[PDB]
Amino acid sequence: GVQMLLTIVGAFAAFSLMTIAVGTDYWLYSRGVCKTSKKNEEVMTHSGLWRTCCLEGNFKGLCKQIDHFPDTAEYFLRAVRASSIFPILSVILLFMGGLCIAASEFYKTRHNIILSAGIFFVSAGLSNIIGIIVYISANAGDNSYSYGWSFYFGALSFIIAEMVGVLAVHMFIDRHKQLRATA
């Protein structure tokens, strides 16, 4: 159907844009040292979630590993922006939602698989918001910082995930209305 084609495309799109977001290293555009004896560094660097690579300087494309642990209670944040479980939990959920949609087009009659997808997309978009907030709220703790296309993919992925969630619920409603009609 038309409502299904969009769901497949939307599930794929959301999952693709979030996987690229979690992997690419252009989340933030800030000023920082792209290398592990005073060093005249402070060169323009682009950072993702785990790697920071400077945009310019004698180290044109040298990368590094972010050090996320540089006293209590707050720590819990430093450890949620260091595993990045919320961005990664959002990838897993979107993948699981796709399985549901795909499984739906095979078994059929089940109806509750189509719903499950709806719960795995809406929650995926909800994990994403928490990951976005945690990201921003951690950098602030530590300027002309600007955001890159990996941030705006994770923002665009959220939008596509919520819309597929609406669409998947709208298909679940329609499946059940067809049952009530025959009754």
Binding site: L115, G118, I119, V122, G125, L126, E162, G165, V166, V169, H170, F172, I173, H176, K177, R180
Partner: protein, 183 residues
Amino acid sequence: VVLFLVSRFSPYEWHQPPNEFGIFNSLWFSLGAFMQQGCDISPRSLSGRIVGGVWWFFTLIIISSYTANLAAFLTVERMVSPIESAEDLAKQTEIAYGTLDSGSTKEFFRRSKIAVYEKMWTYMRSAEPSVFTRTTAEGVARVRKSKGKFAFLLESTMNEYIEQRKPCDTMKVGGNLDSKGYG
């Protein structure tokens, strides 16, 4: 999306929609709610009420934090000071100030027993980077380029001349500190 879902996904409620909270009527309740502007529809289930109760609290804090920060800006700006006398200069540190080297103005401050001018000298002589300039032109440039963070002590004749030169961005303030002449 979550309001839409929690309300209409369950077919046990349908008999005809049980609530009017379709995705569209949910994007409208949530909008109205945020703008404090009340609406006509209101959730009637336990689920749909945990989505309007945490959104009314969110809305409340965000609107209160906009009014209370717009009222902090408008106030602090209302406390701005013109800084137009030597006494004003002497009582603050945000705006640097200095004199020409190797002339009578610098000597005036160095020798003054007047408290305000002694205070000014004590600051100027140890300020870093140097607040002294080698030529009047350099002092003018420093005023013009420093975004209000440098003021220049110079003879009224030179001051009045520069006040009538483009780009007409400087001004003499306060009375003269002494009375003398060129010979």
